[PDB]
Amino acid sequence: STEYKLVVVGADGVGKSALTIQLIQNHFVDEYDPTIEDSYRKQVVIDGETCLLDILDTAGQEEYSAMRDQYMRTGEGFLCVFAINNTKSFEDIHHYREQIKRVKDSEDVPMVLVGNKCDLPSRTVDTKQAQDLARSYGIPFIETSAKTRQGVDDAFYTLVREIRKHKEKMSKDGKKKKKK
Ligand SMILES: Nc1nc2c(ncn2[C@@H]2O[C@H](COP(=O)(O)OP(=O)(O)OP(O)(O)=S)[C@@H](O)[C@H]2O)c(=O)[nH]1
Numbered sequence: 503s504t505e506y507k508l509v510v511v512g513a514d515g516v517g518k519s520a521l522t523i524q525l526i527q528n529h530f531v532d533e534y535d536p537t538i539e540d541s542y543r544k545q546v547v548i549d550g551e552t553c554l555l556d557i558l559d560t561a562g563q564e565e566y567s568a569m570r571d572q573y574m575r576t577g578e579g580f581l582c583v584f585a586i587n588n589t590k591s592f593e594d595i596h597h598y599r600e601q602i603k604r605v606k607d608s609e610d611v612p613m614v615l616v617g618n619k620c621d622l623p624s625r626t627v628d629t630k631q632a633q634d635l636a637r638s639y640g641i642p643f644i645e646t647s648a649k650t651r652q653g654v655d656d657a658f659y660t661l662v663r664e665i666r667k668h669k670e671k672m673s674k675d676g677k678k679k680k681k682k
């Protein structure tokens with residue numbers, strides 16, 4: 503019943519498309535297929551509510567600062583994905599977060615930090631640093647492997663939960679109005 507607009511963001515090659523295709527299609531693309539902009543719908547039951555997910559799988563490839571704006575205005579929550587063997591992709595999260603906060607003109611934007619490719623050896627981004635970054639941001643951190651499907655549903659369902667929490671918070675706000 504309730505629709506949630508989710509946007510999967512992050513550097514090229516982190517696994518945004520692999521995560522999203524696991525969620526929607528239940529298989530893993532070993533392939534490379536760089537994304538311009540694909541979207542997907544899926545009907546899910548999360549905490550006993552039916553949810554219509556409308557998911558945008560974005561381009562990691564850059565230039566943008568053109569393209570990012572409209573889908574940042576549109577998105578209700580953001581899956582901020584880095585790959586655990588890609589230091590720059592982790593560092594990129596700060597910049598995506600800043601951009602989203604600026605473009606949506608809010609300090610309060612539902613987000614989940616996703617460390618993908620946890621099936622691989624010799625990670626270059628430690629779990630502790632990701633956890634520490636998420637704690638700073640006051641957002642969940644979930645480790646995934648699109649290859650094995652580990653954590654995939656949890657990552658997307660947790661983002662829906664963050665949106666719901668935000669919706670409830672915004673009704674009560676901090677002040678000005680109040681509600682519940
Ligand atoms: N080992 C491993 N490989 C993965 C995982 N997720 C994605 N990959 C691989 O990484 C490569 C890039 O994945 P892809 O999903 O296309 O990245 P992207 O983030 O969507 O990249 P883009 O569209 O912005 S350019 C592919 O070869 C894919 O199979 C994972 O969890 N584990």
Ligand SMILES: [Mg+2]
Nearest residue numbers: 518519536537
């Ligand atoms: Mg892609």
